[model samples]
Target: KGAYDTGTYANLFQRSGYREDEIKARLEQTWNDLFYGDEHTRIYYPVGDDKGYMLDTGNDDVRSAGMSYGMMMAVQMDKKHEFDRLWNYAYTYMQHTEGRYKDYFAWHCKPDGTRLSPGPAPDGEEFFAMALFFASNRWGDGPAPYDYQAQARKILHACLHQGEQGEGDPMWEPSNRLIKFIPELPFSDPSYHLPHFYELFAQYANEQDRTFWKEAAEASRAYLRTACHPVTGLSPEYANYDGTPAPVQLHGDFRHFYSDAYRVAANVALDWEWFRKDPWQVQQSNRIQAFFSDIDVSDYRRYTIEGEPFNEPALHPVGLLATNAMASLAADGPDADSFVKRFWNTPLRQGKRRYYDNCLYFFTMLALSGNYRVYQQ
Candidate 1:
């Protein structure tokens, strides 16, 4: 059974021979490094007295994905102030209050709060809702925007019913319960499918939408099975609802496994850790670990699902390693412990590309230490 029902979470770091104190200290140091370190290492920047944003250093802009991820990291670490600051920034800057994108957030913006684009990314909405719900459970609801539970419900409601009156498109495809790459896109990003979050959303979203959330959770799980390759367990960055690689678009071909696809292993592992509803998670985790077991991180590169490598190098190898290590939560294969150890020795990446890698790094560290838990009401 999952930890949600059994109330037991595996401390994979401890199991891998690290002391609890050492693991705790490492996590704290990582948080400090990414949030408060020097210019090269920090991704978070405070805007005035009450708001903050997580900058995508590589892109020199604020991303809803990073802002929502920062909120999740804050709530998980019990940093209520930080969580509130990030939420405030997101609410003030990214959220669309009118027109076709009402109730949705702009996926990217300038540090000064200028919108780079008006389109909403479903991944941001999902993470925002999940983190808000966790904040509500851990710290209780407060006034207005800080009324975390209600805020989450409102987001979920918008996600499901945005287009009902014919003004905007919903984040999810209503008939299939599958999330879109963007509110306007017809395809899904395999990395954005978080069944674990959906399962909890089913419990806490608006009562009328609870059943839809439940079906979404199951739909995501089954979708992952089809999206990932049977032999290598690798998935494409963008895939159709039917599980085929989405065709080349304006953004370039995302048919091969790359940076975005790295999250599938971690997501599957976490779903198993939190719900234990799919036995395929174990097989998938093990298969992916085995495929990379002999490959050195230094040589990591873009590849086809069948394991064919491209000339281009991986943009965030540390993030890839972090997610692979996180798969240890559910992977019992012979190579699992080795992955955990490799990630433990790897320090946070520095420089422009560090934002994504360090985010994954911290989350993986939290999961391995058993600090990532469900904040049940």
Candidate 2:
């Protein structure tokens, strides 16, 4: 692993001279902020008996993305009840039984659980499956949809073979093994390439599907090398199969670094932490940190892959800052310590755009503190 295996992953927060109590304090505080704090920063809400959802506060609806993220957060914190509640809400409200998205979820829903759209987001599906598998491996399965391992395998099966039996398309491009932004699309969101999750899938997925997950992990890592800029390490929010920035379509201006691309740094760092498969990730993490080193978090902006900043302000600056700090997990340069310190000093973001920012913020806190772990057999 060389450069990738040094202090980069030995837990930066723990190495930063913080006492054990301090480290645990930071992680638990961020988790509490997102799960049980002020209205703006907190997103999880309980509904009917044994059901709850994580609202996408900015979007004014519940999304599979937030729900699954909540489950991941809960599972990592050992909050089994919260994880089960979120899964039950998603299973009851967002899941489609007889459509192209069968065994998958509608991406968005009203608070009352009405479907907002019929489509699914591949990120949501992948995260949901990963979290469920983690839950199963950590705590064992329950009955039916609560049967975490069985539910996870079913979702993975649909992700790879959806169209084989009938009318829908698979979540991933069959030949390339790169996950699509959505099943109907030909492109991908760069942030959706979670090789760490795929590595676990290779071990946990059914026998017939294990090989596909192994290939997908390799393809994702290779795809990311092309999707991210060589100089600045900035990846577009969306990219084509060949890894060039995909042209903007229904969503506006996805060709530039925005909210979605903020996760790419954290994803790469975690991938390297869990597998040490990509040495380039060390260089990429350092590159991205160095790119933002001179810019204040307040001055964070949307930018092109060439490192040109947009006049517009960033929508999730705290999230971006959190991710930059999380990059220390794979970064071995001067900027790594600076990023972690800056994030530790700053408080969680609050207000209208709090949901996504705080969610990412919490995950970063977990990663940096070494609280995020693989709960596997």
Candidate 3:
């Protein structure tokens, strides 16, 4: 009876009383802006036959993060052509053949399909696997890397057992069930914990691995409870497994609220919308929105967990705005309606930082419009 049900998910936007015609138009417009908009703002580019790339135009690199996100977006829109194109490009350019990240895609690559870094980011792998699973269920499988379900299984298997047969690191801490920032790191990025995807993995992953995914969902929900500041609901970009902000020694003040932490709110909101597994998500989302309720979007900035704003401004103000709005999925606060209306009035970001802002922008639009959902057979 609810959008959070298993067989089919509900469109929370419609359920929440948004106008259907307006929601439909915004969704279409935002999708077109990112996939086929003007040259400067668009992130996708067609390559050879049946292949395409989602460029991180700001970084001038093809990242597994962006590529996987593009695939997820394409699949959500039921654009199988673009989904396969993005996947083919990722498998061809970013996937590693050997070493510490075997079978995992490189975190960064050149636009010409050359490796810039051999390391794998766990966020990319998780999105790739979930998007592939959705693709398989939505559109069926195909050959080689395009054999969606099998490809997804291979990625998940590698994530859990990368070094078991040789000399690599698993994407997650085996004992904790939380995803690491990278394979070798002990700390985790709070944004990377997608319990909703884990819930699906429990049902769809390979037989022996299904149980692990189920536990992962429980562990991640528990972890987020610790990771987010109870009063402000602000999570760090990186945190120790115990939920404390990881030390600043490793990655240049990653302990503060910044680019990466923005996704944590969205992740929490979507998990709540998808599974209703944690009633606390309602409170958490309300906290995040309440923290931003009085602040002008123009004045968004990096902040400490206690809700003190940093002297530095936010790098992705629009991206932060989008995630804040998407938090409405779980939020029942008075300001939730204000965010949706503000987001509706905003246009897609353009120019240098457009890539990240627009990516987050499309996702917000999708979630708020009820287009982002579980794809099932």
Candidate 4:
């Protein structure tokens, strides 16, 4: 009865680190938590980590996580009421200038809309952008006509930097990589998320800017391929300006932690290699698949709080992306959507695992899938 629903396993299998039976059990527990009883529907955390409270339910950060993931999940599930409810609450309270989040698009906030802190966290801003697109795309294909434009305008307001907005590409290191690496994941710009952000930029910006986004995209694709050890295909989670392996000496940064490696590899192999068909993706896809033999899809599940024991299995960005990316390489259709429902809808397992952009991966994947068109101007 934590942050997510049991229905998350609706369409997934091998490569997600689950057996058929376990998926059923976990899914059953989640469903029970959500339907038969009370699910932890609370959003935002009231306190910070210095207090030693694990996954404090009474916090604004928890609320933002709920709004972002729950709203996004509602869109994917076609549940209009839930989506609207969450959206209205956030906008009315969280987005208010006097609100707890200062109505700003930040990671956490108070129920009264007071913001916990401020910083772009490009990955988050990118997600805010993609969420608008996904909601719009879904609304277009269905009966509900979402005020996607307005929602996007408001939620993504912070994503645009006026002075540098037109100068730098949206896919730049600071935009996508930096935001997601904060608090606990280290300080370096996360190149792993570059592909999707570049994809988002290509869709939202003009042709003049498209090349900039693509170049950043292409640059990372090439860098990861070259930097990776030929045998392991696992590149360092973080890297230098020239795309060299990041030194282990760096501390208090996302690169310092080994946890970010899987998602990083996923971005390189699945999103870049398969989605964009970049050469580096081609170089590493087959090579990287060798690392995890035990993973299967049914293992997918969400942990509501930042420190949930059962949550470890949910860290299957590599498995999820690799499975679907390989599908794109093989044919025009995939058997099932590869979205990791648990990853985003759940609470932060570690400082590096952001609830915002993690959910944005769903929208980013839809666009990257190539055939599925996202809404355009």
Candidate 5:
């Protein structure tokens, strides 16, 4: 059953014959490497005495996605100081104060606090809300913006009600309860579905919106089933509300499984680990692992949901492997342990594109060690 019901999370690393101390040490080292290591490894940067930001090294910009992710990682590690610093930076620089996007964060910014884009990404909002709720539960609320629970509630309120005054669009579709790729966009990113987080939000969001969160959890679970392939378990980076791959857009082709799609496996595994509300997650996890079983990490590439490979190489193969290993949390198949072992031996990526890869790597490490957890009230 689920950890929410039994209060017992599986430490996949331990089950794979790794010692507890070793696993703990590995988690710590990874946290340190990404947050405080040398230039080649670290993504986090302190701005001043009271703020910090996570840099997207490849893009050389500060993204709301990375900032929220850093906050989540800090809260998970019980680094209250780090969590507060990241939140303060986001609040000071990224948040929209008086515009259509008010209460939503600008998705990207320069290191010096200049906005790179005024639009917000739905993934950032969801992650920001979840991390703030966790901070409130784990470290308790403080004054003003540091009143974590209140801040989280405000974000959730905006997510569902933004369009009511005919100003900005809501991040989620009220009728279907599926989150959008962006508040202004009608399409969705399959990887952005987070039923596990929504389940907790249902209990903690504003009383009036609690029901919406509950329905959203169920909606996302069902949406993922259709978004993922029946045989390969691959999902498109962008999909329609009906879960079909979205049409090619002016930005780029996101129909094939690529960087954004890698997170679906890890997200599915976590949802199953925490709630086990869907049996399909288990089967899907197994199918994905089996698909990658014979392929070396170096051989990773873009592919259609049918498992046909493209000429383009995978930009974040380590991140893909990390998620596949994380799938072992819910995958009850012959290849599960092998993926875990392979991931255990892989190191964090270095150089420019390391930001996205290492972020997934750290989250996967946390999950495999059973440290990625819910902080309840």
Candidate 6:
């Protein structure tokens, strides 16, 4: 799992037409450093330094995500050295202990591997949940490969089906606040729960699980139709199972919304959503890893729809990638380069949290074409 670093993993076995070994040394280094720097382990040496100081803060929930991404690269790359180093480091710190609930992994840890608490909101626990799911395939040592799958299944079940079972009928309301990492219940954006359960199930299905996989896709497709608008295509950050709920409660986390915005057009968008909502959502949802695929490789302005330019209001690559990949969001349009340039050109994206710079994960995935599962094989 170690050899091909995430940066190069996307292009390794595909027609991505990118040069390998370019970002590899540096990126894998970045991956290792973010979690198991010299302070944490002696074998896994980091490239330089992580831009985010994951070692110091708890928001390093991304470290788990990043690490999982790295492992994916390793296995595909067949670079056992890199994979082994990364796998061991993650194994050291991710284990759950007392009080934090058994089977749940922590987001970040001290070099010695002590769990970091989730801050402001309750993301730390959840971050590990998704990260663990991503890590399952990286380590195929015996049943350990499915170990993460088991944990992720537990989390996934609890996320959708547990606790009041979402009440008789599904209803969405916009009561979300930006501060809430994920606004639970009363209507929350589907973005909050991501790396999509249904799509993953569809691809990773064993014979027995196929029905549930198709069911989830249908539920969400039907969901997009009612909750989202046709012309506007702007789905409320929160929607009841149906839009019958009044005065949507909140404005969704901009991060989540921005990422998911572009991927709005599914199959035939609303028409398809209404017709075969189940398979449609799964079909559409499954295409998520293809967000940047339609882009003009030479210039960002190009799109799969021929005449479509970079910033077409609905269905932009950045938006869909953000929505489908992780719940974090970003914006794109005709003015995209200008918008990004405006930030560099002026004071637009200066502060922090600017989607332009902070969204390295998306660019990396695009460059790497990390969504290898897009095909129905």
TM-scores, in order shown? 0.99, 0.97, 0.97, 0.54, 0.99, 0.45
lDDT of 5 at 146: 98
Q: What's the number of clashes in each of the models?
A: 0, 0, 1, 44, 0, 31
lDDT of 4 by residue, 154-238 (tens): 4433333322433222224444332323323333343345565456555554445555556655555555555555664554556
Stretches of model 1 off by over 4 angstroms after superposition = none
TM-score for model 2? 0.97
- Per-model C-alpha lDDT, please? 0.92, 0.89, 0.89, 0.41, 0.94, 0.36
Q: Is 2 or 6 the stronger prediction by lDDT?
A: 2
lDDT for position 349 in model 4: 20
Model 1: worst 10 consecutive residues (lDDT sum): 163-172
Question: Candidate 4 vs candidate 6: which has greater lDDT?
Answer: 4
Per-residue alpha-carbon lDDT of model 6 for 1-377, expressed as tens digits? Answer: 11122222223213323344533544454344333554432112333232121222223233444444444444444444554444455555664332322333444555555556422112333333434445556543235433655655554443333224432211112222111223234443433332233445545544454455556554554555554443333343333445322243465332222333343432222222122223434334333323444443224332322133335333233324333332111122332233222222221111223222223333333333333222111
Give per-model CA RMSD: 0.8, 2.1, 1.5, 10.6, 0.8, 10.9
How displaced is residue 115 in candidate 2, in Å? Answer: 0.6
For model 2, what is the error of residue 59's alpha carbon versus the real structure, in angstroms, after optimal superposition? 1.1
Q: Which run of 10 residues does model 4 get worst, by summed lDDT?
A: 1-10
lDDT of 3: 0.89
Tens-place lDDT per residue, model 2, 14-127, is 687777788888887877777778776778888777999998888899988999899999998999988999999999999888877899899999988999898999889999
Q: Tell me the spans in candidate 2 whose CA falls farther than 4 Å from its real position.
A: 1-9
